[PDB]
Design a protein around this ligand. Structure first.
Ligand SMILES: CC(C)CCC[C@@H](C)[C@H]1CC[C@H]2[C@@H]3CC=C4C[C@@H](O)CC[C@]4(C)[C@H]3CC[C@]12C
Ligand SMILES: CC(C)CCC[C@@H](C)[C@H]1CC[C@H]2[C@@H]3CC=C4C[C@@H](O)CC[C@]4(C)[C@H]3CC[C@]12C
Ligand SMILES: CC(C)CCC[C@@H](C)[C@H]1CC[C@H]2[C@@H]3CC=C4C[C@@H](O)CC[C@]4(C)[C@H]3CC[C@]12C
Ligand SMILES: CC(C)CCC[C@@H](C)[C@H]1CC[C@H]2[C@@H]3CC=C4C[C@@H](O)CC[C@]4(C)[C@H]3CC[C@]12C
Ligand SMILES: CC(C)CCC[C@@H](C)[C@H]1CC[C@H]2[C@@H]3CC=C4C[C@@H](O)CC[C@]4(C)[C@H]3CC[C@]12C
Ligand SMILES: NCCc1c[nH]cn1
Lengths: 224, 288, 342, 230, 57
């Protein structure tokens, strides 16, 4: 019942549908990572190791393509566009361990570590990331070790009964971030200690992403 | 006597509406378009036709003891009954194989998920291969072996007492599928346990929850292998055993008991695969 | 001293405006339209389902021929649909997949889109090469692009999350006029039928009326309790409706300079994403977070009907210029075309 | 946009020849392609069609089974493999691009053509020639055996102009729309089976042969052509 | 002196908005009601057209 040109137009639509599926299949093999964190928290240094608006980074590790998105330039309201990132494979959060005793420049009375905790708590407990795992990077571990000898953790945590060793101090901070998670059953937090000279950070992301993908696959296949 | 009629009617009620909800919830929700969701639909359709066509038509054969629907209609029933049961076993392998690729080829599994063209190709291959296993053999046995040894009033396959054909056909119908399902559901368990071991070493409530979830999957995988084996092995073994002794060594009432086990599997399947699926339960509550 | 005195004068001016609006609030629109008969029950069926987007649809816009429409999704694809046949006319791959808005030029020769990349990209649909190409990228906003609307083939107005709206000269790529005054992210804008004025709704829960040529704010409309997400002019240009996160729609009048009617229900507790009017303006269609589109009686504030055909947020909707059909876009990646039957 | 044909020349009867059409300056894979030939001192005759993506192929009855049309999208080349060539095949073969979507303009660009020499809706243009003077309005009539108005509202009638020494150019597509780059003085009017092309304020460039083509169904057929002379 | 500069602009803007002519709400309500009544018949969504006249059958 279609005319000669109508059949050609229908055939053109089929060609478009074929190309949309190929683009969807190609985009389905990409791992989308949302990169978050405060200023001077090693967020830019992580991108170097991983090799005006949103900044996108592309890298490949062991036949796996990663798309990392930086939204630090967006000074607008977060809640108006944070749902656009619903469905990312994982969220990479960067926290500077050396900023445990430092004070935020803008407020001049708020500790930097507490500022990261508020940012981590809001993102982790956000309604759009209920089932989204978080990869936690604790940067500046070498500088944190030096600051521990001079300044104890009591400045950041008044109610800290632990020792002043590097291992105990670093482990206490890791537990504090993981205690901020309220969706313990639906999401998991992967914590890593990074430095400027570290080269295993990309391996940690690959291992953490593979675990998240497998858990999602088991959920999709009915096992989970 | 009336007790048997009630049980057979109850099996029809459970199988028909049980597998109808899966088909209804498939249409109702537009997000159930993954390859795994189509495979669960294929298993539901195969079992739905068992409770709607095969079981209702076989009731007179039990209550009366003789087939009164004619020889011509008997061949239709035999082809359909063997096709549906075989397709049910092949869908279980297809589902288990799909779950095998979710843990081994995890990256490609997520990418290829949602491609309906891939799903439809695999679904059609299941039905076509199910038909070729018993379809031609049932129809062409009488016309190539000479006469028919089936007495009037009885409706069963021409190879009912054959010994060489039953073991050959059952190997491709139950023996190979059972080992494939056992292997697939064992590799999944090994990967999950191995992956959790590295996670604990690399890294509270989250760790305890993950271990508990793995144990829940371990029981889920064991039931899938056990139920498939429990329903199918007795009848498959009895067919080979009874063929050698021509029914002398096997009690008559044992054959009927094992005959209905396979049809019982078509009612358990809605409970196992679709109900335990995360997405199908959400689509179930939307309808009810 | 000087700062304290000035901010006191602003409070006096605000009271002066509030008293002026109260002086002319002799009657209510509800009282005026009490006598007229209701529209009855509005039943619309899904005539078409547009499939092919593989992610959340964030925006749609009808062309002026009431047959072609453009939709934007965060799969990085702009698709132009033939709504009569469901044929895909074009598929434009976006450089940035984080699109939040799309616009169809009234001439039909151009489409525009943009999102978190802070860029409004203009695409040429009528090229001798037979493909859609980027003709202009409008840079200058320091926040995400929330809405864009063509005035003609050379002018477009954009609203951004940097609290400002801009008027652009497409040929030169420069914003001729900047509209400042919102204290929050501007989420939407609507053009008046004569394209001499436009209203914008921001996250400061206020709607401002802007003069395109003069470039200043003429009037400010308040009354919402949360961020305004959607805005639409009345077909005669003398009123507009807004939709906010407070589960309410309000009808503001330009000449009376105040709210005339509120469209809310006790069952509705979700935010509003999109608003539009029917051709005569008697119906107000609003998209909601609860996966539904509610058709309101504009004059009597009665819920005339419900369009329930999506399994996720209704992110956008639009009514054709001839008024024949309404399209709804959703986060479930589908577009649906609705109209009633006799 | 360019379309260059090659491979034509004098061939023996019953022989084989391969015609090539190289495309540059446009998205070749997005356009369907036609071969149209024109016998010396005769009108246009459609030969073959291959769609975008090579999924659909049509041939005229006079060449079906002997001609093969193919395309090379990466090389942007259109091919016409000819076999068992007869004296009836002596013509200039034109490479024509045509894209099909809502509001598109098929047959908008033609190639220069290559000459080969060998050793159904009826479209009627009864008026073979029309004496004209510059600045005066001229009307050209076309008729069809079947109604070109489809049930979707389109009337699939096309108007072409072939100036002396030049390839045909599209003037009016779907009986009313004006092709890109064509002066507004040309206007197409029609109804059912009778169509008129009106040329207000005729100029020197408008002198040429005018062809009406139907695109209602395959095979596409041309009218005899009406020549305008001063 | 950023706050004092912003204060002058905000006060000046409020002066422009306070000097506009406002019509009665009843007058504005009547105009909206009149426009809806006049264009009611040419609204397909309000009054659905016969299936023969519906492009989206
Ligand atoms: C819904 C539940 C109850 C279904 C249970 C299915 C089984 C357990 C029931 C349903 C049909 C029943 C069979 C009906 C007919 C016969 C043939 C008779 O000569 C021996 C008993 C026997 C073999 C019954 C055994 C039990 C039976 C197979
Ligand atoms: C004896 C047989 C022929 C009776 C009919 C059974 C088969 C043919 C019927 C019964 C249930 C039907 C299915 C019900 C639901 C769907 C989902 C829909 O999205 C595609 C069609 C599909 C998959 C139908 C295909 C045909 C179907 C499988
Ligand atoms: C791929 C699968 C679905 C194809 C299934 C085809 C089936 C349904 C068709 C194809 C061949 C048909 C059979 C052809 C011959 C006979 C013998 C006759 O005395 C009874 C009908 C009967 C038994 C037909 C039953 C239905 C039948 C088996
Ligand atoms: C008794 C005999 C005839 C039963 C035959 C069953 C076969 C023919 C029927 C039953 C289930 C049906 C399938 C159910 C679902 C789908 C998915 C749909 O997107 C394409 C058709 C397809 C693939 C159907 C193909 C035909 C099908 C396989
Ligand atoms: C004569 C034939 C029917 C006997 C063979 C039966 C078994 C071995 C056949 C029948 C159905 C087949 C499956 C059908 C579809 C697929 C999907 C494909 O991507 C992987 C192989 C896989 C999983 C096949 C594995 C082998 C299989 C299970
Ligand atoms: N080959 C399976 C036949 C059967 C057994 N039970 C019911 N039907």
């Amino acid at each position: 019942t279609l005319s000669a040109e109508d059949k050609a137009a229908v055939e053109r639509s089929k060609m478009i549908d074929r190309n949309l599926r190929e683009d969807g299949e190609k985009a389905a093999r990409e791992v989308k990572l949302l990169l978050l964190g405060a200023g001077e928290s090693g967020k830019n240094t992580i991108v170097k190791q991983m090799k005006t608006g949103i900044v996108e980074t592309h890298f490949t590790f062991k036949d796996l393509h990663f798309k990392m998105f930086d939204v630090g330039a967006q000074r607008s309201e977060r809640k108006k566009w944070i749902h656009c990132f619903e469905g990312v494979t994982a969220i990479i959060f960067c926290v500077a361990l050396s900023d445990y005793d430092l004070v935020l420049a803008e407020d001049e009375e708020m500790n930097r570590m507490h500022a990261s905790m508020k940012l981590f708590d809001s993102i982790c407990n956000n309604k759009w990331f209920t089932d989204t795992s978080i990869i936690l990077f604790l940067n500046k571990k070498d500088l944190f070790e030096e600051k521990i000898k001079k300044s104890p953790l009591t400045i950041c945590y008044p109610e800290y009964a632990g020792s002043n060793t590097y291992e105990e101090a670093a482990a206490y901070i890791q537990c504090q971030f993981e205690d901020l998670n309220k969706r313990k059953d639906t999401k998991e937090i992967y914590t890593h200690f990074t430095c400027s000279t570290d080269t295993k950070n990309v391996q940690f992301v690959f291992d953490a992403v593979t675990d998240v993908i497998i858990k999602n696959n088991l959920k999709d296949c009915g096992l989970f | 006597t009336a007790v048997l009629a009630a049980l057979m009617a109850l099996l029809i009620v459970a199988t028909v509406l049980g597998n109808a909800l899966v088909m209804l919830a498939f249409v109702a929700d537009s997000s159930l378009r993954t390859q795994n969701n189509f495979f669960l639909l294929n298993l539901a359709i195969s079992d739905f036709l068992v409770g709607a066509f095969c079981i209702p038509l076989y009731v007179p054969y039990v209550l009366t003891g003789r087939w009164t629907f004619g020889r011509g209609l008997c061949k239709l029933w035999l082809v359909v009954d063997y096709l549906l049961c075989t397709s049910s076993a092949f869908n279980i392998v297809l589902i288990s194989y799909d779950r095998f690729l979710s843990v081994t080829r995890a990256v490609s599994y997520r990418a290829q998920q949602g491609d309906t063209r891939r799903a439809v190709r695999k679904m059609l291959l299941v039905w076509v291969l199910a038909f070729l296993l018993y379809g031609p053999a049932i129809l062409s046995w009488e016309y190539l072996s000479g006469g028919s040894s089936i007495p009037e009033g009885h409706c069963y396959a021409e190879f009912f007492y054959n010994w060489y054909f039953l073991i050959t056909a059952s190997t491709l119908e139950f023996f190979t599928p059972f080992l494939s399902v056992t292997f697939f559901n064992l590799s999944i368990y090994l990967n999950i346990q191995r992956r959790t071991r590295l996670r604990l070493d690399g890294a509270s409530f989250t760790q305890r929850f993950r271990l508990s979830r793995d144990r829940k999957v371990a029981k889920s995988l064991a039931v899938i292998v056990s139920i498939f084996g429990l329903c199918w092995a007795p009848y498959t073994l009895l067919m080979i055993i009874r063929a050698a002794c021509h029914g002398h060594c096997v009690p008559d009432y044992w054959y009927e008991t094992s005959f209905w086990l396979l049809w019982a599997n078509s009612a358990v399947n809605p409970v196992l695969y679709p109900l335990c699926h995360h997405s199908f339960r959400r689509a179930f509550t939307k309808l009810l | 001293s000087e700062l304290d005195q000035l901010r006191q004068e602003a409070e006096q001016l605000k009271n002066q405006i509030r008293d002026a609006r109260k002086a002319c609030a002799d009657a209510t629109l509800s009282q005026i339209t009490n006598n007229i008969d209701p529209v009855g029950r509005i039943q619309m069926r899904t005539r078409r389902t547009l499939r092919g987007h593989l992610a959340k649809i964030y925006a749609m816009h009808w062309g002026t021929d009431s047959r072609l429409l453009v939709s934007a999704s965060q799969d990085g694809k702009l698709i132009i649909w033939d709504s009569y046949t469901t044929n895909k006319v074009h598929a434009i791959p976006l450089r940035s997949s984080w699109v939040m808005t799309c616009a169809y030029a009234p001439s039909g020769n151009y489409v525009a889109c943009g999102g978190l990349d802070n860029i409004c990209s203009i695409y040429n649909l009528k090229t001798r090469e037979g493909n859609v190409r980027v003709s202009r990228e409008l840079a200058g906003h320091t926040g995400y692009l929330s809405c864009c609307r063509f005035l003609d083939d050379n002018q477009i107005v954009t609203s951004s999350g940097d609290t400002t709206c801009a008027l652009w000269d497409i040929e030169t790529g420069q914003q001729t006029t900047t509209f400042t005054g919102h204290t929050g992210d501007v989420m939407s804008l609507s053009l008046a039928p004569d394209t001499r004025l436009f209203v914008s709704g921001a996250c400061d829960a206020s709607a401002k009326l802007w003069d395109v040529r003069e470039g200043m704010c003429r009037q400010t409309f308040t009354g919402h309790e949360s961020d305004i997400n959607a805005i639409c002019f009345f077909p005669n240009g003398n009123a507009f409706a807004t939709g906010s996160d407070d589960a309410t729609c309000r009808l503001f009048d330009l000449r009376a300079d105040q709210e005339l009617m509120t469209y809310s229900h006790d069952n509705i507790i979700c935010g509003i994403t999109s608003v539009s009017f029917s051709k005569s303006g008697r119906l107000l269609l609003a998209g909601y977070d609860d996966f539904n589109c509610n058709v309101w009686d504009a004059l009597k504030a009665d819920r005339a009907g419900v369009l329930a055909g999506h399994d996720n947020r209704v992110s956008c909707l639009g009514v054709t210029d001839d008024g024949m059909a309404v399209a709804t876009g959703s986060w479930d990646s589908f577009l649906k075309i609705w109209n009633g039957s006799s | 946009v360019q379309l260059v044909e090659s491979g034509g020349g004098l061939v023996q009867p019953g022989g084989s020849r391969k015609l090539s059409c190289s495309a540059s300056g446009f998205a070749f894979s997005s356009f369907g392609m036609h071969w149209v030939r024109q016998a010396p001192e005769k009108g246009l005759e459609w030969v073959a069609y291959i769609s975008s993506g090579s999924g659909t192929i049509y041939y005229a009855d006079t060449v079906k089974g002997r001609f093969t049309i193919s395309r090379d999208d990466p090389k942007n080349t259109l091919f016409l493999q000819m076999t068992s060539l007869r004296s009836e095949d002596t013509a200039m073969y034109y490479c024509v691009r045509s894209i099909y979507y809502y509001g598109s303009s098929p047959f908008d660009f033609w190639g220069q053509g290559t000459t080969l020499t060998v050793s159904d809706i009826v479209m009627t243009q009864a008026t073979s020639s029309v004496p004209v003077t510059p600045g005066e309005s001229v009307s050209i009539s076309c008729r069809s055996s079947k109604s070109l108005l489809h049930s979707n509202g389109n009337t699939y009638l096309y108007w072409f102009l072939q100036r002396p020494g030049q390839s045909p150019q599209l003037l009016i597509y779907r009986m009313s729309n004006l092709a890109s780059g064509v002066p507004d003085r040309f206007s197409g009017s029609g109804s059912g089976t009778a169509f008129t092309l009106t040329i207000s304020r005729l100029e020197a460039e408008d002198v040429g042969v005018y062809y009406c083509m139907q695109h209602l169904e395959y095979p596409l057929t041309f009218g005899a052509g009406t020549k305008l002379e001063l | 002196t950023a706050s004092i500069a912003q204060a002058r602009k905000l006060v000046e803007q409020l002066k422009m908005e306070a000097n506009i002519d406002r019509i009665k709400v009843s007058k504005a309500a009547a105009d909206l009601m009149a426009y809806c009544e006049a264009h009611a018949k040419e609204d397909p969504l309000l009054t659905p057209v016969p299936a023969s006249e519906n492009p989206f059958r």
